Design a protein around this ligand. Structure first.
Ligand SMILES: O=C(O)[C@H](O)[C@@H](O)[C@H](O)[C@H](O)COP(=O)(O)O
Ligand SMILES: O=C(O)[C@H](O)[C@@H](O)[C@H](O)[C@H](O)COP(=O)(O)O
Lengths: 468, 468
């Protein structure tokens, strides 16, 4: 009888099935369109692996060891609820459903209560790493039933990416906390990509770097503190030549960014809970503005973007190194926002999130993977209740040393009309959060003036209304 | 019998009752606690007006002319639905309920459906102007039943603020469109207040203006193109002396901004629909960051904000005039965002909003009222298909002449570490919306690299996936 089952056999589910099989576990798979089941078994025997395929969910469930465990890798929608409903007709007390898709956390909360009515345990698990990580080692973010986690943790530990001896998996917490952490991972991923792209236009249009010089700089950055998956693939992307023309492939790609929800969800949560995530908004702003390609073209035909002619007396020596420090400084600031969001939500939901553990399993497998995440992990291992990431002693020193470079980059970009919303939003966020006194005193005065909303004073307690 | 009735006698409801009476209409009022109903009648006596009070809602409904019209000014919550149901137990076919509170538009849609099942017409009406506007003239944003609007239009026209002889009321559209327009008014208002507060901190910390000079500058600006309620009251606020100390009152106000939902709702709507509103995020970011007053104090103690020492050879000539032009430029950009939001939402909701009419009724009564809004109303009445506000010929000229001032302001603020998120977000929004090519090509290549999401090409049709 099978150790675990998996429903949903796109390339993601196929690769995870091969991953589980290659680790010595016997796995049964199902997919309504049977050719995907056939493709999985074909790929398994081509790699000398064993994957059992069944034509129905009933036959798959019947071949599962007790306690029965099934992984769901189905595109988000009513097809997930239809499969859960069908599974609950054959599962019994103590069996486990594991949803591995990018889900909105409120949806998983509903499915947890529904399965619990039949005493079926539910694990809502975020997965990061794509098709490659699904096959060779990804980052698992399971949350929900701790009992469910314990029954499957050996599979997750062996199939996840390994950072030294440490598997990239942890018990996130109860309920839908696993979906929430994976959502925030993608939100942070949105920010890193927007910051990298802004570094790309800064060197292209201020330093006049061609695509070959750009790829070299990113590869040089990947050898240092900025070592990361996104910096690495960016260096590869910028050097890629087109095979339909004689241009660079990145110059032939239409600048309309897609998006599938997780970035928007992070933003909705930050707005609703009053948690400031300015770098998040900048990344979303860029993607949402890019959609209106025809309007942007007509708008530029009225507001012509003149070609950037650099002042010959412009001090641009060490500017490339200033940009390195600024981009690193912005990652500290951006991750501070994301980790602050996770901390406040954990406190509001009583999830008891372990931010050091979350940072640890983000060191490999996932998209934001970087040696940067090992520094974050160490910061929270030393202070589990750290309020803001850059208040850690080491990160604080990094900020104090690299912030002048950030100001220099924002200055030059502003002077030459280069849009850098994520860079400037990150600098603004740091300056406001480190300001004991902000101009919201005037805002409060205005609100009392036109709305009689009252205000508080600095020198005494109470709520005061003034006849201005 | 009474021409109309009003339920809910806080200061807003009391003043509107006096307003309706002062315009010649016979109005009956009711409040759950009878103490407020008496107070309304005493104040009516003292102002040589007559307002009829009733002890229960049944007597009020019995004294209404057909078609019966009742105005609701109840604090948002279940009490609104409770009063609606209580009213539906006595209204007949063709009677009208008008809700005037700051309501979330989805909740009004529900109340419109229920009242329509009882054949009672519903009017969800946004109201802006505060206590003074309720008494002497506010901006009414009624949406829903066109039959209900036509039956109550003369009361709304005479009680609204008058710009010349044009009353600040219009039929917004069907459904809850009136609540949505009022919500976006507050969103724009949030942006105006944040931009003004950044002008204040720029002059205070870069130019070293004290409060007397600050008040003089805003008064000076109120005489020119920036003539507006918010600029005017800002001048009064900055000059206001505290009577408990010998300091300026605004300096004794704790910098923790309140917020009661409408600004947050505007951002939630923009985020969910993918409509870029970066200036709204900056306004909300500033208010949300201000709440963390204790963390901000601890943060500055570690990140000491040095005294802003201005370079003696810094060219600050015409800097005050650059700030004037920059603030006016940001208002153009911010209203471009908010009016684009209204346009896109009108399309998606099939509301057929008249942006020229909405701008017209925002010229008086409401908080954002300004001669600026007459220019906006004229721009849309000249071209009802205008897409972006700053694409109007005269607004386009303003951007071209004033955008260099905005760059100069952002440059100086960046150099001297002044957080100005709304100014920088406005400038970034303009530079992105007017960019034919944005670095989202790199983002699209990354998403195809790690997620196989495919990309589009600039030179041919189709969706392409590259083995990078
Ligand atoms: O962690 C990952 O492996 C990716 O982030 C994964 O979740 C997927 O690629 C998302 O769809 C990307 O997000 P967008 O499609 O919204 O850019
Ligand atoms: O248009 C108006 O007359 C005001 O905007 C009114 O709606 C009220 O004063 C809001 O409560 C202000 O908004 P906040 O309280 O969220 O700042």
């Amino acid at each position: 009888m099978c150790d675990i089952g998996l429903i949903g056999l796109a390339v993601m589910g196929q690769n995870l099935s091969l991953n589980i099989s290659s680790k010595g576990f016997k796995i049964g798979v199902y997919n309504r369109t049977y050719e995907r089941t056939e493709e999985t078994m074909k790929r398994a025997k081509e790699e000398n692996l064993v994957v059992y395929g069944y034509k129905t969910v009933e036959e798959l469930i019947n071949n599962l060891k007790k306690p029965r465990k099934v992984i769901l890798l189905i595109k988000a929608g009513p097809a997930v609820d239809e499969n859960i409903s069908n599974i609950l007709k054959h599962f019994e007390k103590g069996d486990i459903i594991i949803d591995g898709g990018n889900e909105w956390y409120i949806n998983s909360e509903r499915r947890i209560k529904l399965c619990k009515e039949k005493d079926v345990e539910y694990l809502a698990m975020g997965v990061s790493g794509g098709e490659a990580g699904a096959r060779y080692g990804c980052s698992f973010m399971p949350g929900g039933s701790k009992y469910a986690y314990d029954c499957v943790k050996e599979i997750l530990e062996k199939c996840s990416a390994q950072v030294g001896n440490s598997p990239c998996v942890t018990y996130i917490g109860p309920g839908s906390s696993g979906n929430y952490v994976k959502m925030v991972h993608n939100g942070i991923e949105y920010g890193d990509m927007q910051l990298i792209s802004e570094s790309y236009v800064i060197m292209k249009h201020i330093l006049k770097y061609d695509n070959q010089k750009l790829s070299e700089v990113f590869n040089k950055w990947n050898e240092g503190i900025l070592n990361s998956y996104l910096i690495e693939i960016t260096a590869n992307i910028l050097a890629k030549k087109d095979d339909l023309t004689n241009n660079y492939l990145v110059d032939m790609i239409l600048d309309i960014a897609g998006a599938k929800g997780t970035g928007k969800w992070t933003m909705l949560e930050a707005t609703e809970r009053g948690i400031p995530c300015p770098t998040m908004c900048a990344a979303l702003d860029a993607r949402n503005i890019s959609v209106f390609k025809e309007l942007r073209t007509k708008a530029e035909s009225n507001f012509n973007k003149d070609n950037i002619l650099i002042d010959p007396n412009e001090d641009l020596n060490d500017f490339e190194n200033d940009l390195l420090n600024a981009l690193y400084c912005c990652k500290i600031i951006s991750y501070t926002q994301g980790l602050f969001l996770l901390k406040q939500v954990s406190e509001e939901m009583n999830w008891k999130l372990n931010l050091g553990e979350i940072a640890r399993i983000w060191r490999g497998g996932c998209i934001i993977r970087a040696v940067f995440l090992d520094r974050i992990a160490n910061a929270y291992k030393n202070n589990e209740k750290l309020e803001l990431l850059f208040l850690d002693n080491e990160f604080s020193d990094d900020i104090k040393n690299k912030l002048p470079s950030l100001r220099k980059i924002v200055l030059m970009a502003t002077k030459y009309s280069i849009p850098i919303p994520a860079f400037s939003a990150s600098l603004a966020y740091f300056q406001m959060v480190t300001s004991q006194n902000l101009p919201l005193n005037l805002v409060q005065a205005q609100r009392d003036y036109f709305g009689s909303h009252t205000y508080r004073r600095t020198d005494r307690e109470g709520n005061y209304h003034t006849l201005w």
